[PDB]
PDB file of C-alpha atoms and ligand atoms in Angstrom:
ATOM      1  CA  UNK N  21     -75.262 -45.662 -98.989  1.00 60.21           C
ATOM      2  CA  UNK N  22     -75.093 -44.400 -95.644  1.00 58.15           C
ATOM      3  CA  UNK N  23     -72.237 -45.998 -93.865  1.00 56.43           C
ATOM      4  CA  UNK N  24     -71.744 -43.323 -91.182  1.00 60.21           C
ATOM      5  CA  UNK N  25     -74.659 -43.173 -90.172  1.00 61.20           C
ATOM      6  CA  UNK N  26     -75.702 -39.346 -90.888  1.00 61.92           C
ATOM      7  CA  UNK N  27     -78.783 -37.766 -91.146  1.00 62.23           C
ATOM      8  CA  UNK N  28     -77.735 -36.946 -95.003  1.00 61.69           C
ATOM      9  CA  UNK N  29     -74.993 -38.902 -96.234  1.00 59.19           C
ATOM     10  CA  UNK N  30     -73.433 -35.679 -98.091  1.00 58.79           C
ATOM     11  CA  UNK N  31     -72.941 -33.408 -95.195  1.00 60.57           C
ATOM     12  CA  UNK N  32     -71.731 -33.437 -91.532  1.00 60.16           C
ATOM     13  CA  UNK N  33     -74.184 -31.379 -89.199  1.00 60.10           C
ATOM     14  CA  UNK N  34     -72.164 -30.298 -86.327  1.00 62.82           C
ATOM     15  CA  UNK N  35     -73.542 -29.110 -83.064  1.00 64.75           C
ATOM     16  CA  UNK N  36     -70.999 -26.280 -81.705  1.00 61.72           C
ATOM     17  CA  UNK N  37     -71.029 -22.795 -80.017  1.00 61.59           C
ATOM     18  CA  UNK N  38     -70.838 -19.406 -80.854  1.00 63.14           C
ATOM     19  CA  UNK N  39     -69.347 -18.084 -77.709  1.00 63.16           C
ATOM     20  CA  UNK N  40     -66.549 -20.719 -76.670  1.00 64.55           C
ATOM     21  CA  UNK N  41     -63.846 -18.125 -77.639  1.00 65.98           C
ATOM     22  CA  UNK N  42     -60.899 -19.992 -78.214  1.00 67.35           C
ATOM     23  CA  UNK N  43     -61.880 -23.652 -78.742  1.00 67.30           C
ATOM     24  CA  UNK N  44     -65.058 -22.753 -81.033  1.00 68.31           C
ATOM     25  CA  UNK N  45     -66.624 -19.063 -81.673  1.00 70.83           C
ATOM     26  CA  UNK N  46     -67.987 -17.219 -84.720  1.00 72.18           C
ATOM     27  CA  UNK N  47     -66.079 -14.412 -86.200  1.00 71.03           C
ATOM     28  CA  UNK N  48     -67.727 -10.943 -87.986  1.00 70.12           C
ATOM     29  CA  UNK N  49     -69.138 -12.733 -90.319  1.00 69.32           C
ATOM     30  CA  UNK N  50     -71.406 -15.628 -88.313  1.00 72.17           C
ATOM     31  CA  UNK N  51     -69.309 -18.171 -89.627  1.00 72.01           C
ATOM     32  CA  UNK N  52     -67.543 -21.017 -86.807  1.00 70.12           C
ATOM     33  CA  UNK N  53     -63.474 -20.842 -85.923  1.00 69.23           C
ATOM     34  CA  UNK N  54     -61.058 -22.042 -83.290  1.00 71.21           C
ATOM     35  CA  UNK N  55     -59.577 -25.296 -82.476  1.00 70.77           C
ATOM     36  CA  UNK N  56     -62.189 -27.790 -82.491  1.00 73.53           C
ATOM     37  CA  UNK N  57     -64.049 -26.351 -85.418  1.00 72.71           C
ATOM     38  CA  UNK N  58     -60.508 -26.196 -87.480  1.00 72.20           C
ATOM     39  CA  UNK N  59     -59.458 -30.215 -85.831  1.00 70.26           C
ATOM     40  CA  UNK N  60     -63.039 -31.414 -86.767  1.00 71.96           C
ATOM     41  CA  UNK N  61     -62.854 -29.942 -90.424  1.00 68.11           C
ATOM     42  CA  UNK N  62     -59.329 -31.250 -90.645  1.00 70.89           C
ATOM     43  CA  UNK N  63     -60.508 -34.736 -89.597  1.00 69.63           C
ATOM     44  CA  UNK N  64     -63.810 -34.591 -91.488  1.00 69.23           C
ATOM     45  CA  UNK N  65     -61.894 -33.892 -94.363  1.00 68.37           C
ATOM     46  CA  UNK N  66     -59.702 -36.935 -94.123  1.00 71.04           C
ATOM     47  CA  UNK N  67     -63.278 -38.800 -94.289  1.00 68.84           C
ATOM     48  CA  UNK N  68     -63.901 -37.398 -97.595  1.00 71.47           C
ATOM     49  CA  UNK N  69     -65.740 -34.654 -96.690  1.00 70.53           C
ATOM     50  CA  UNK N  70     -64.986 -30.620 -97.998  1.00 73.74           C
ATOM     51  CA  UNK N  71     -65.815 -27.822 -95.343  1.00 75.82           C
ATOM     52  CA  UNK N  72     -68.595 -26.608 -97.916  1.00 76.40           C
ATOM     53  CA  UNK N  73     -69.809 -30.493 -96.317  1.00 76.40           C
ATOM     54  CA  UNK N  74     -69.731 -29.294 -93.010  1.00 72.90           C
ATOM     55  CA  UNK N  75     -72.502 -27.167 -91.456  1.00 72.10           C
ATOM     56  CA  UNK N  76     -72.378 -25.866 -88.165  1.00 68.70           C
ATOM     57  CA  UNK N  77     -75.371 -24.718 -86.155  1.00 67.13           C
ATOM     58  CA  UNK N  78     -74.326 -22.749 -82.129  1.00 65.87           C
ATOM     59  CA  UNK N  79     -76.125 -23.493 -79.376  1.00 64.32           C
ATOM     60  CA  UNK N  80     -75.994 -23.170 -75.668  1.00 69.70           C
ATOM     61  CA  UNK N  81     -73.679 -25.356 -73.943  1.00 70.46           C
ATOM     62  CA  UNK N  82     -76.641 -27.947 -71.516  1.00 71.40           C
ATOM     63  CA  UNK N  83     -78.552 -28.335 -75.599  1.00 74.80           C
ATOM     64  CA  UNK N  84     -75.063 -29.960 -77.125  1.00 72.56           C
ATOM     65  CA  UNK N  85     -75.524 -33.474 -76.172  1.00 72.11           C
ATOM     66  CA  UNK N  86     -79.521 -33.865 -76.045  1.00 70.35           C
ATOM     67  CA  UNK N  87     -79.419 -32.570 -79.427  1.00 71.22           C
ATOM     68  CA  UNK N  88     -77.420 -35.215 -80.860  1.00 69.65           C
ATOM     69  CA  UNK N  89     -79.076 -37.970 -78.735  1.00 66.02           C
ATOM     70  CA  UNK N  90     -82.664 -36.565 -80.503  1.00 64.60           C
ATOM     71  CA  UNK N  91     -81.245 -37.155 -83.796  1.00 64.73           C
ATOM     72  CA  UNK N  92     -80.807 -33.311 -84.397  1.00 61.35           C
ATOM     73  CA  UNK N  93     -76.713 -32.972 -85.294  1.00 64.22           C
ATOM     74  CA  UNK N  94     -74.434 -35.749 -86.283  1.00 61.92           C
ATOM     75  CA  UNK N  95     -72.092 -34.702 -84.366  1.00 58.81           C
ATOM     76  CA  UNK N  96     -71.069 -31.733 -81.985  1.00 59.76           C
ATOM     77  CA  UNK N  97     -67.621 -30.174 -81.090  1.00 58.13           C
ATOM     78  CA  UNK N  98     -67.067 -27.318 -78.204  1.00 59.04           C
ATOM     79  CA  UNK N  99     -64.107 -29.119 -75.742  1.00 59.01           C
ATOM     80  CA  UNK N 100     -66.796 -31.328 -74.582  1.00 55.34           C
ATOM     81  CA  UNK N 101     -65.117 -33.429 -71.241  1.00 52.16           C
ATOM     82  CA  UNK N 102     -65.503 -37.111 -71.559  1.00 52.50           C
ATOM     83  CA  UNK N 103     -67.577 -38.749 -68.562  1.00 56.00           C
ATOM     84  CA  UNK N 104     -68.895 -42.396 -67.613  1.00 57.09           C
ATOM     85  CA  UNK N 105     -72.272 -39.865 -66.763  1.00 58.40           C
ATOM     86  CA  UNK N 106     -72.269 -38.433 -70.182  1.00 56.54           C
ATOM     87  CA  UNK N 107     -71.675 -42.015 -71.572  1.00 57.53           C
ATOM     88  CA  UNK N 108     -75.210 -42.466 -69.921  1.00 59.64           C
ATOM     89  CA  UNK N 109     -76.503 -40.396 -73.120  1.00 59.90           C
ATOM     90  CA  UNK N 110     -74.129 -40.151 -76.057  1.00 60.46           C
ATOM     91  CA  UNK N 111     -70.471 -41.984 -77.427  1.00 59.44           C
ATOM     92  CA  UNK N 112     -67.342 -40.214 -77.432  1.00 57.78           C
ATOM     93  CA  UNK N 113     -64.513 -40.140 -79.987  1.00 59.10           C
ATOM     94  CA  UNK N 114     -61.036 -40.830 -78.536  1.00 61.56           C
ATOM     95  CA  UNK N 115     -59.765 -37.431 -76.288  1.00 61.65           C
ATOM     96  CA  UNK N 116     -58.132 -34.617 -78.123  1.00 61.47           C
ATOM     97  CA  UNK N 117     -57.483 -31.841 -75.891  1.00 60.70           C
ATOM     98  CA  UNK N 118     -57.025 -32.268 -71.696  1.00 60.21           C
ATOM     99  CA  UNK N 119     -56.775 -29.005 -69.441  1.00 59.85           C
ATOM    100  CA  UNK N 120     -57.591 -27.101 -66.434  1.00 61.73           C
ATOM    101  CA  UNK N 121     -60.527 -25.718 -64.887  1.00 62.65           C
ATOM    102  CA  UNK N 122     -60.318 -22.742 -64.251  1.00 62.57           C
ATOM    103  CA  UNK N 123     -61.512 -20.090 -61.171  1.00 64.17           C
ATOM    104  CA  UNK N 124     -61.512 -16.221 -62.913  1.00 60.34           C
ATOM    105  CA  UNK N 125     -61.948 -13.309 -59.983  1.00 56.85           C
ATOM    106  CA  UNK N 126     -60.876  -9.815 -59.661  1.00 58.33           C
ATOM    107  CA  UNK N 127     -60.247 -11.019 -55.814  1.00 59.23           C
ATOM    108  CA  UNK N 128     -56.428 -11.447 -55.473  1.00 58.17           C
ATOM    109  CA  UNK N 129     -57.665 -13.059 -51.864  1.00 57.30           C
ATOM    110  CA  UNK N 130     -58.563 -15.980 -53.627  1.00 62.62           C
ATOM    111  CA  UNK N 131     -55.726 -18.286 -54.239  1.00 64.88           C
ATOM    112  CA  UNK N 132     -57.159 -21.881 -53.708  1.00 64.54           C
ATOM    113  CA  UNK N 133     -60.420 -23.987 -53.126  1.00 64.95           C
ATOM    114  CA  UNK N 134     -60.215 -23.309 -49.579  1.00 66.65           C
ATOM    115  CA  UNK N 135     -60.635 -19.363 -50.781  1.00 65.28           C
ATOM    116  CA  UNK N 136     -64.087 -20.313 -52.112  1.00 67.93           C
ATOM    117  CA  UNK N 137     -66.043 -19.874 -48.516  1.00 67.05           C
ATOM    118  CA  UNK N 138     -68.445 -17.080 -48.289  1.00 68.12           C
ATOM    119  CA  UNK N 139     -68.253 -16.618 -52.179  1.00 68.57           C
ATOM    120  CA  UNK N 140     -70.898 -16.188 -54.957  1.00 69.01           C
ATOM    121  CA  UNK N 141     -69.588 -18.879 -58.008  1.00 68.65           C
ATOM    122  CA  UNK N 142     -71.005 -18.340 -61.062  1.00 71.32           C
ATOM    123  CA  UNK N 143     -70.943 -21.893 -63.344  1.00 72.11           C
ATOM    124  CA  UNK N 144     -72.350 -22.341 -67.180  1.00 75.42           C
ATOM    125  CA  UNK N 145     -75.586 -24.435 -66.545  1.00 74.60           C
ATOM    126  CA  UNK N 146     -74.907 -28.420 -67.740  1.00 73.51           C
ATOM    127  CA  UNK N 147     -70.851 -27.837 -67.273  1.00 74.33           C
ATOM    128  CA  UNK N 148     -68.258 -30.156 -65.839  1.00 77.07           C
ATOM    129  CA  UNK N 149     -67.190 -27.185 -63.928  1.00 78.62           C
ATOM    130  CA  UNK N 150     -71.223 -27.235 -62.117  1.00 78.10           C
ATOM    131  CA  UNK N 151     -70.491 -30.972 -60.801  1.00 79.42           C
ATOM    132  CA  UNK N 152     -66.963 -29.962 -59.723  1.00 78.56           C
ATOM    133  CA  UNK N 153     -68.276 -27.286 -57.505  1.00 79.49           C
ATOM    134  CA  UNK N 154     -71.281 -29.281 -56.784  1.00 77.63           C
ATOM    135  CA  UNK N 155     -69.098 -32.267 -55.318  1.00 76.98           C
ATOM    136  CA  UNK N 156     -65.791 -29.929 -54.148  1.00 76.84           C
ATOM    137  CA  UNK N 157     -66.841 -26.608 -53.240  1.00 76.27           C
ATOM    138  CA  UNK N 158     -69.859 -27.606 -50.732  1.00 76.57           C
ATOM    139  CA  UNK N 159     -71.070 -24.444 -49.339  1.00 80.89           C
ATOM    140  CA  UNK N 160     -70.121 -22.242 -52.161  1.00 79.43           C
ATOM    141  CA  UNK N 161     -73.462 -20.665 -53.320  1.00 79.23           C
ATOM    142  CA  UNK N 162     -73.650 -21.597 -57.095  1.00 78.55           C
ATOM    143  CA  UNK N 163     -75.319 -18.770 -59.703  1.00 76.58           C
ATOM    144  CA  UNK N 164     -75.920 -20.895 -62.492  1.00 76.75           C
ATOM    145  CA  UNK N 165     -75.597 -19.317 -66.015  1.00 76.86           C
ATOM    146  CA  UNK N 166     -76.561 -20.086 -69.716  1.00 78.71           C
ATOM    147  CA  UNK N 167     -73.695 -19.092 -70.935  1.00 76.66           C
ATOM    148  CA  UNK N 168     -69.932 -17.758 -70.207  1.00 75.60           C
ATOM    149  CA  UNK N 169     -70.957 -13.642 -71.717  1.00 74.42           C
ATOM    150  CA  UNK N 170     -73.753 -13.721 -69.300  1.00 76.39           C
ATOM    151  CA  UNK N 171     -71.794 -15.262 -66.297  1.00 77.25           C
ATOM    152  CA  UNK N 172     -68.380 -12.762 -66.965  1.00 77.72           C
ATOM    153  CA  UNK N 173     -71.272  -9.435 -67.372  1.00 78.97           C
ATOM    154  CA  UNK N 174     -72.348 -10.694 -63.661  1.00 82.21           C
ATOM    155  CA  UNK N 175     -69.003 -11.077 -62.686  1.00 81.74           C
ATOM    156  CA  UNK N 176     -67.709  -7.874 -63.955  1.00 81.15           C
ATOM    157  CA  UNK N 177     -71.105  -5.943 -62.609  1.00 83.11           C
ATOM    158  CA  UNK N 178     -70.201  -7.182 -58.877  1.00 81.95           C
ATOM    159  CA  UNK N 179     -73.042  -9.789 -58.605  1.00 82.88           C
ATOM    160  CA  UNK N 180     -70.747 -12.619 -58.682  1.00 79.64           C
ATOM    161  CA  UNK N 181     -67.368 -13.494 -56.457  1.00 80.62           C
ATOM    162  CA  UNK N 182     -66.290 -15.657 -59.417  1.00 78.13           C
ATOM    163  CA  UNK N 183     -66.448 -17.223 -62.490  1.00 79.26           C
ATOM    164  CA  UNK N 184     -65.586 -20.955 -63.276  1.00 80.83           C
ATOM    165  CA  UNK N 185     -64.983 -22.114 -66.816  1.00 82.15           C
ATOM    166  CA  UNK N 186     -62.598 -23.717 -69.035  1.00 83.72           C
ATOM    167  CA  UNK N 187     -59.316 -22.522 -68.883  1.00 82.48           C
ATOM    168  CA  UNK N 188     -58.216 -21.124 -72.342  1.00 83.30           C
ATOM    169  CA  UNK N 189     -61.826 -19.190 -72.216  1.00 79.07           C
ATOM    170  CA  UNK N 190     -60.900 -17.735 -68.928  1.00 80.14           C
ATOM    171  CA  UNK N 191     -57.459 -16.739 -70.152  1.00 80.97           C
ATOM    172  CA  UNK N 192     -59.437 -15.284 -73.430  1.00 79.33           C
ATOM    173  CA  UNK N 193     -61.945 -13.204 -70.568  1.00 80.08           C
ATOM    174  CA  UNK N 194     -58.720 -12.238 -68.734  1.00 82.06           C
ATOM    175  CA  UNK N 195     -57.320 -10.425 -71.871  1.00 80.30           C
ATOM    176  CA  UNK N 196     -61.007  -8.795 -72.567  1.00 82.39           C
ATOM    177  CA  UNK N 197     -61.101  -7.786 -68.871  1.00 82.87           C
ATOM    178  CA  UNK N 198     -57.649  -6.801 -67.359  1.00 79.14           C
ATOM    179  CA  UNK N 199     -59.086  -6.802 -63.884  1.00 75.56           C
ATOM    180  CA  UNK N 200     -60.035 -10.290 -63.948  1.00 74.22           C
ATOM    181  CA  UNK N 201     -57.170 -13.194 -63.522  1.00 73.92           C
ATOM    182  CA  UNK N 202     -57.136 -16.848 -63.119  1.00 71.16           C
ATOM    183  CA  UNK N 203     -56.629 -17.518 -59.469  1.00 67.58           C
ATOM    184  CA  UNK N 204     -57.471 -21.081 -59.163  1.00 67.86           C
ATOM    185  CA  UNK N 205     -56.418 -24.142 -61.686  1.00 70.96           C
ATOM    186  CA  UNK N 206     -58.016 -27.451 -61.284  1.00 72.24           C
ATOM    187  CA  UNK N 207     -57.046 -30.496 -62.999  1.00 72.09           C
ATOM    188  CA  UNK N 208     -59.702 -32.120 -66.003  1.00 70.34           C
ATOM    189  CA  UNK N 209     -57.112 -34.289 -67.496  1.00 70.16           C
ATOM    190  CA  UNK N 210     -59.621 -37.476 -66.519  1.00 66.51           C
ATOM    191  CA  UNK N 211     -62.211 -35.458 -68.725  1.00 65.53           C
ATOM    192  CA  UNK N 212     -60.163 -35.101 -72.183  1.00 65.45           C
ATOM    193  CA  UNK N 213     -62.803 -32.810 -74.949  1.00 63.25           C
ATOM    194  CA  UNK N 214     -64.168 -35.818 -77.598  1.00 62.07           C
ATOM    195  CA  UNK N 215     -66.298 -35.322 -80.347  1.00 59.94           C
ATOM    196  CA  UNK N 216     -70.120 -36.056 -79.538  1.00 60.69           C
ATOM    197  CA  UNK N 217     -71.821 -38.859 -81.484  1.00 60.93           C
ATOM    198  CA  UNK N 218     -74.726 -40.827 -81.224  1.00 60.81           C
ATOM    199  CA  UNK N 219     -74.263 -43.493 -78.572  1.00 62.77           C
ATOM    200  CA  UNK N 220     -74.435 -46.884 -80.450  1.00 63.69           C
ATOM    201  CA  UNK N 221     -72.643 -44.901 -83.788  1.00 64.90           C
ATOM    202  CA  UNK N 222     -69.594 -46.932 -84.223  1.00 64.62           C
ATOM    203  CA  UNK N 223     -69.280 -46.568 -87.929  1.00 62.12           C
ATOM    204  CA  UNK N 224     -69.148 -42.619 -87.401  1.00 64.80           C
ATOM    205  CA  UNK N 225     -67.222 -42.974 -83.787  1.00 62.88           C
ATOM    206  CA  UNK N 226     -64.317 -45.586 -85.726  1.00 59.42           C
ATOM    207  CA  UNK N 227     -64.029 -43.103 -88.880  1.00 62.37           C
ATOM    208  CA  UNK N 228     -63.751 -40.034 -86.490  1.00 62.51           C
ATOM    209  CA  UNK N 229     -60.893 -41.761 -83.978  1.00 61.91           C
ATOM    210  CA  UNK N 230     -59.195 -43.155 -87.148  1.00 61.48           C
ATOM    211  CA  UNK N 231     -58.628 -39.253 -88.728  1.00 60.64           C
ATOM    212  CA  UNK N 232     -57.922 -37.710 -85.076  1.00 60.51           C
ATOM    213  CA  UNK N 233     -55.296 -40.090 -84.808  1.00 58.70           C
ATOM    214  CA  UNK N 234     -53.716 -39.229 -88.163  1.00 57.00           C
ATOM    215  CA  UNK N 235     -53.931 -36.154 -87.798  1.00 55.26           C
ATOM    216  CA  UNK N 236     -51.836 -36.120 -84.647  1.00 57.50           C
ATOM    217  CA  UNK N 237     -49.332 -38.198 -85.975  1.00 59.84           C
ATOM    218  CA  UNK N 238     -48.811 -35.929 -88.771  1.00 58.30           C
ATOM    219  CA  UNK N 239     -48.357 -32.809 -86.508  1.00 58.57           C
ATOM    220  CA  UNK N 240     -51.512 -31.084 -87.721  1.00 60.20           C
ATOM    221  CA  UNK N 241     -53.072 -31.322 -84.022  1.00 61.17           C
ATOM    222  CA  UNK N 242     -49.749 -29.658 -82.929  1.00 64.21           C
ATOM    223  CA  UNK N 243     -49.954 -27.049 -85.177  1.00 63.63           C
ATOM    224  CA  UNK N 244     -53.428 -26.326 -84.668  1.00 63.11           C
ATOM    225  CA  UNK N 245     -52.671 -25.968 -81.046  1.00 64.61           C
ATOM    226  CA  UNK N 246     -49.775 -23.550 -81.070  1.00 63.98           C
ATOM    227  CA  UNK N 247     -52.275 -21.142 -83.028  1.00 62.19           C
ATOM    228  CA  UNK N 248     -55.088 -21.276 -80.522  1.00 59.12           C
ATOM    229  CA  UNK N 249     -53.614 -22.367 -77.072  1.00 61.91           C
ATOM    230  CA  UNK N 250     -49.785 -20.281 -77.598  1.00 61.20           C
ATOM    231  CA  UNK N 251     -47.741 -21.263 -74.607  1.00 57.17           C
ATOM    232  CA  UNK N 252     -49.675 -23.860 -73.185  1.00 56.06           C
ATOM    233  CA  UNK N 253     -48.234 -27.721 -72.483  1.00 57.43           C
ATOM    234  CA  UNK N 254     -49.013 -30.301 -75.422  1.00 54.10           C
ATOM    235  CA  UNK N 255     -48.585 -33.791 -74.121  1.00 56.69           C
ATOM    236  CA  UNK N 256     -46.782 -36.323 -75.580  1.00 56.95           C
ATOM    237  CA  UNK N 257     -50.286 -38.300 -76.084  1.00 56.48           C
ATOM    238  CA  UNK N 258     -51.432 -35.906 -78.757  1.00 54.24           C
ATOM    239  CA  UNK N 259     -47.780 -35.270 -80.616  1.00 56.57           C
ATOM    240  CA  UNK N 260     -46.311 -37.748 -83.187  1.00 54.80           C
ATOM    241  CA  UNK N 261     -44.875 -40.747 -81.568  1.00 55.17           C
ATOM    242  CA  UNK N 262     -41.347 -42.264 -82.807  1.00 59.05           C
TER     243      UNK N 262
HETATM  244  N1  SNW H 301     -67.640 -25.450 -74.216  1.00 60.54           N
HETATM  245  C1  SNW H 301     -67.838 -25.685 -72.821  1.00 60.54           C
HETATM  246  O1  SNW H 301     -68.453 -24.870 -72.153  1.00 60.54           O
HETATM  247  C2  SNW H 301     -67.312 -26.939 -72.172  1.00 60.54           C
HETATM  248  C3  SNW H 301     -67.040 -26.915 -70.691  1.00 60.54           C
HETATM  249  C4  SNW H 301     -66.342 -28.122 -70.054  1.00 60.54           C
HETATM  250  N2  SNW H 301     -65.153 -28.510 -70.794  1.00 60.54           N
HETATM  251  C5  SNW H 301     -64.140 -29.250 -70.003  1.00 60.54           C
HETATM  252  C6  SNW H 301     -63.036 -29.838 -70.848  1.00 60.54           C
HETATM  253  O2  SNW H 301     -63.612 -30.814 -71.589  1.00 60.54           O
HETATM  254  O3  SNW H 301     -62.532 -28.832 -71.714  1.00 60.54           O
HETATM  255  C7  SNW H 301     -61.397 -29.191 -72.512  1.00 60.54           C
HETATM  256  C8  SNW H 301     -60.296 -29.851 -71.674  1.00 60.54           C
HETATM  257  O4  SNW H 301     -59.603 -28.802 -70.961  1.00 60.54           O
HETATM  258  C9  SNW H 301     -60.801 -30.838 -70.774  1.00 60.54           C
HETATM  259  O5  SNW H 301     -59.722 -31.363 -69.894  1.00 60.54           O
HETATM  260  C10 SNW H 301     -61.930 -30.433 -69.978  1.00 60.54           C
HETATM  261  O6  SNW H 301     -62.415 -31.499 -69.140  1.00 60.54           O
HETATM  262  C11 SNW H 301     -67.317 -29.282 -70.078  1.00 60.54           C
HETATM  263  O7  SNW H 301     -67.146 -30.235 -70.849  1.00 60.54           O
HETATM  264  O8  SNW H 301     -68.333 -29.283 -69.367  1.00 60.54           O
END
């Protein structure tokens, strides 16, 4: 039987990336890490299913969610926000992980949105952070990107002002390039990162939010989240309760 609806009831094919450095990346070897590949193996595991079960395939950021619409991945897992416009397309598992967005420059000038006039902003083509600009930052001219490598090589060559992506991955591009810092934090906490499922997939969706929730309450998700995100907030939401 299939009851969560998979395209092979015996493994999970997860749509991730290989360059979302810390929430998903692959190490030396090819094969996936960071928080949402270790939460969704930990959760996929409560559903019966070993990480041998698991396969993961990386792709650029805009191919995620028409992938899994076209039947290609049952799933896919790189701190995708949750939107009513994304809703359009695919279902969402309940949130897991809610942050900043984040404005990386070398220009200590830059110290708010307001900073933003008569700059270049580079965005990852299909991002939340593109709408946020598109909607906030009027004006702005936007460079769009395929990818965070290709918009941080532009930014560190002089082509670009700026960079806007999600926050751990700018702190992770801060470390890699000393000269750049995060000048600008804006709030995504009405976005939370869900797991990507085929809209209509209940049986898959139900299963998923059933072993996200245990594994909060059990302190895994906690865990998990002092080893990639060190120092930043956990909310109460996400921690065991009682
Ligand atoms: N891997 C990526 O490039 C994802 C970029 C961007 N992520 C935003 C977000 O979902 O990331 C994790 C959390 O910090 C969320 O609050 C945030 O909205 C997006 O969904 O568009």
């Amino acid at each position: 039987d299939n009851p969560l609806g998979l395209i092979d009831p015996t493994t999970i094919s997860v749509g991730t990336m290989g360059d979302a450095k810390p929430y998903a990346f692959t190490t030396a070897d090819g094969n996936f890490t960071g928080f949402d590949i270790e939460l969704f193996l930990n959760v996929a595991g409560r559903l019966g299913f070993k990480k041998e079960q698991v396969v993961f395939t990386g792709q650029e950021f805009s191919a995620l969610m028409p992938s899994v619409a076209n039947g290609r991945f049952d799933v896919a897992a790189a701190a995708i926000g949750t939107t009513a416009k994304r809703k359009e397309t695919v279902d969402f598992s309940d949130g897991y992980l809610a942050g900043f967005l984040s404005v990386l420059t070398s220009e200590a000038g830059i110290t708010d949105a307001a900073g933003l006039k008569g700059k270049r902003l580079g965005v990852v083509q299909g991002t939340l952070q593109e709408i946020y600009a598109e909607k906030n930052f009027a004006g702005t001219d936007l460079v769009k990107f395929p990818d965070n490598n290709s918009a941080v090589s532009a930014l560190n060559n002089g082509t670009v002002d700026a960079h806007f992506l999600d926050f751990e991955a700018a702190k992770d591009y801060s470390a890699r390039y000393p000269a750049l810092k995060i000048a600008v934090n804006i709030p995504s906490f009405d976005a939370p990162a869900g797991f990507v499922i085929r809209k209509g997939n209940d049986a898959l969706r139900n299963a998923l939010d059933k072993g996200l929730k245990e594994a909060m309450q059990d302190g895994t998700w906690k865990k998990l989240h002092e080893k990639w995100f060190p120092g930043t907030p956990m909310p109460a939401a996400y921690l065991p309760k009682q």
